[PDB]
Amino acid sequence: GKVHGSLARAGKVKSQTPKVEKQEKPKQPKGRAYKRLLYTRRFVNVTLTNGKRKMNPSPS
Amino acid sequence: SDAITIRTRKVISNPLLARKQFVVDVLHPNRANVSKDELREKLAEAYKAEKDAVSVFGFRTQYGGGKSTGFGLVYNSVADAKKFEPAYRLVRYGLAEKVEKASRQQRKQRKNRGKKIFGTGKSIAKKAARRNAD
Amino acid sequence: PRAPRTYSKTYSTPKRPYESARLDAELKLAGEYGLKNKREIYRISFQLSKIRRAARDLLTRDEKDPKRLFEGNALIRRLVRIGVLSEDKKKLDYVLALKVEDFLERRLQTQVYKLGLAKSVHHARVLISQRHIAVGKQIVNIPSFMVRLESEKHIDFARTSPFGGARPGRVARKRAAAAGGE
Amino acid sequence: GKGKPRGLNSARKLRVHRRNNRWAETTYKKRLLGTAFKSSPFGGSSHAKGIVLEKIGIESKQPNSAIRKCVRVQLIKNGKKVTAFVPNDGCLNFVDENDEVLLAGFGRKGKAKGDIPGVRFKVVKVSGVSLLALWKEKKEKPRS
RNA sequence: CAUCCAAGGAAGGCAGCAGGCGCGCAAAUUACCCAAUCCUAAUUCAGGGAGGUAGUGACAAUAAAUAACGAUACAGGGCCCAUUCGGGUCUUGUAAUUGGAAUGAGUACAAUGUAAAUACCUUAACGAGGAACAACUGGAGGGCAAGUCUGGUGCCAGCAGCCG
Ligand SMILES: [Mg+2]
Ligand SMILES: [Mg+2]
Ligand SMILES: [Mg+2]
Ligand SMILES: [Mg+2]
Ligand SMILES: [Mg+2]
Ligand SMILES: [Mg+2]
Ligand SMILES: [Mg+2]
Ligand SMILES: [Mg+2]
Ligand SMILES: [Mg+2]
Incomplete structure (x- = not known):
């Protein structure tokens, strides 16, 4: 109908969201290695010189 | 290639205490610290004195190994070392023995218990015994 | 009640x-010299700011003034002894014209890299660490060991290190033992 | 030239003029009157515990249509009663009635924040445990 | 305001070091010892919860690990010109490929350290492959660096210091 349940119930969206498990990953290096990775990714491996840097460019 | 070598810098004679003070600079590559007793002996035949009138302490193997630095004294006689050095050094070197001391808390407890009684406890013991007798 | 010894901050985060642009410059300087954090750049900028504050205060004072002479040449000799200020411009x-990059x-990181015994800046960082x-026969496990001019000629691998000549180390010794056993 | 005197011997009136004008500020007046100790629910206190009396929800303003889940808490330090906000999504059920809850400031200098009317305090801890640890299931309510 | 009480009496002062109750958002172990600083005394020697040492301690403060380097496959830029090429001629990244090194964080013979012990400095013998020895805390509309990607809810749930 208009509303699928009791409207004012607390923790509604949290309760009914689909629990999607964390995706397992390779370890992300931390510390000086992370700064080196960022430096390589931004100032020696310039990817999209057009426009801005556009870090995290949405895929479309 | 062990070759523990020793040096005595800033040596000052001192008949005020009948001693000779110095800083021990021991160069020892490919080796850990110098295990004081061994260096006491080294100074003993270094300064033509017995292994008893020689003391070392305050050692510090510097960062990175190799060199180490401490303080050392050489006494004119073993008796002077006996009568001038602190008790704990005379215990470290085996020339004296640890004194049989009760713990500090027990000593203070006994001190207060002795405070409770005026004069010797001879009379009060028998008095209390014959008191609880009747 | 014992007399305190004074701890003091050694950096200052920027207000913006x-x-x-500043973030990109900080990342440039971090990647160029293998700095672990951006607190390193803040620390160097703080040291430079203290130096500049002293320099400007001495500049305000009149020329040929005992304070100016004494502490100005003291700071000059300290900076040239560090090596950041070239002898030409004492x-x-x-x-006031020094930059943080100086x-x-x-x-000691960049100096080990320059001498070539470490082939990469991060290689210099790890080799120091x-x-x-x-x-000068005294190891330094600290990247920010400001190498002075009088002593730069005495950087090399230590004797205790395998590179300076000693036992190889855990992995090589274990592999040699395994090869000898089998 | 200007309203203030300028003579070399006019320190007295300059000082008293500044001292009389300082009361025009709100921070200075609050600090000197010490209204925080006497009138505010907490006397110069960043946090304060309290007991949950009941479990209310309060509607928002015009531009924002919702019901923010609040809680009425009687403070233990002095006995005042104030409404407080249970911050996150599913945290209303976490705090039960008549349990000790540590309220904190709401971040807007003791004034209502956003679209929630007549509330000035968050909720940080309940029954000794923090709400943020409960919300990510890092800890659980002791249920005593 | 309290304590023991044989109901006649007696004894109290932690804003000393510990520790406890209470209070409150809010603060430590009934630990070791006179080694060091000194102090008291008839005076070296005795004593000192003064004090020092440790215990807890993310109040603050300093330095700083969480990888480094090759050899391979997928690539990109300075290219010999530009027969389409293209060798990659010169380099720089991306790949659960793949190798050899180095090292602590930990354990631990010792010795140093210390009044005695921890702990640090040194160092035997162990101690890295997913080097699982796995770095979090907040944020991704603007202020303010970073998404108009996917799914869910549809002025609910909630977010939002302010605008929203
Ligand atoms: Mg107390
Ligand atoms: Mg004290
Ligand atoms: Mg505290
Ligand atoms: Mg601890
Ligand atoms: Mg880790
Ligand atoms: Mg995150
Ligand atoms: Mg968020
Ligand atoms: Mg999001
Ligand atoms: Mg932006």
Whole structure:
């Protein structure tokens, strides 16, 4: 109908969201290695010189 | 290639205490610290004195190994070392023995218990015994 | 009640924390010299700011004034002894002209890299951190060991290190033992 | 030239003029009157515990249509009663009635924040445990 | 305001070191010892919860690990020109490929350290492959660096210091 349940119930969206498990990953290096990775990714491996840097460019 | 070598810098004679003070600079590559007793002996035949009138302490193997630095004294006689050095050094070197001391808390407890009684406890013991007798 | 010894801060975060150009410059300097954090750049900038404050205060004072002479040449000799200020410009007006990259350049990290015994800046960082480089038969496990001019000639791998000549180490010794056994 | 005197011997009136004008500020007046100790629910206190009396929800303003889940808490330090906000999504059920809850400031200098009317305090801890640890299931309510 | 009480009496002062109750958002172990600083005394020697040492301690403060380097496959830029090429001629990244090194964080013979012990400095013998020895805390409309990607809810749930 208009509303699928009791409207004012607390923790509604949290309760009914689909629990999607964390995706397992390779370890992300931390510390000086992370700064080196960022430096390589931004100032020696310039990817999209057009426009801005556009870090995290949405895929479309 | 062990070759523990020793040096005595800033040596000052001192008949005020009948001693000779110095800083021990021991160069020892490919080796850990110098295990004081061994260096006491080294100074003993270094300064033509017995292994008893020689003391070392305050050692510090510097960062990175190799060199180490401490303080050392050489006494004119073993008796002077006996009568001038602190008790704990005379215990470290085996020339004296640890004194049989009760713990500090027990000593203070006994001190207060002795405070409770005026004069010797001879009379009060028998008095209390014959008191609880009747 | 014992007399305190004075701890003191050694850095100062910038007031605008979110400047795009400044963030990019900080990342450039971090990647160029293998700095672990951006607190390193803050620390060098703080040291430079103290130096500049002293220099400007001495500049305000009149020329040929005992304070100016004494502490100005003291700061000059200290900076040339560090090596950041070239001998050509010992004038106390080029002191205001120093950049943070100048003090960055004198780090034991970059000096080990320059000497070539470490082939990469991060390689220099790890080699320093693994207790290998010794500045005058004294190892320094600290990347920010400001190497002074009088002692730069005495950087090399330590004797205790395998590179300076000693037992190889855990992995090589274990492999040799395994090969000898089998 | 200007309203203030300028003579070398006019320190007295300059000082008393500044001292009389300082009361025009709100921060200075609050600090000197010490209204925080006497009138505010907490006397110069960043946090304060309290007991949950009941469990209310309060509607928002015009531009924002919702019901923010609040809680009425009687403070233990002095006995005042104030409404407080249970911040996150599913945290209303976490705090039960008549349990000790540590309220904190709401971040807007003791004034109502956003679209929630007549509230000035968050909720940080309940029954000794923090709400943020409960909300990510890092800890659980002791249920005593 | 309290304590023991044989109901006649007696004894109290932690804003000393510990520790406890209470209070409150809010603060430590009934630990070791006179080694060091000194102090008291008839005076070296005795004593000192003064004090020092440790215990807890993310109040603050300093330095700083969480990888480094090859050899291979997928690539990109300075290219010999530009027969389409293209060798990659010169380099720089991306790949659960793949190798050899180095090292602590931990354990631990010792010795140093210390009044005695921890702990640090040194160092035997162990101690890295997913080097699982796995770095979090907040944020991704603007202020303010970073998404108009996917799914869910549809002025609910909630977010939002302010605008929203
Ligand atoms: Mg107390
Ligand atoms: Mg004290
Ligand atoms: Mg506290
Ligand atoms: Mg601890
Ligand atoms: Mg880790
Ligand atoms: Mg995150
Ligand atoms: Mg968020
Ligand atoms: Mg999001
Ligand atoms: Mg932006």
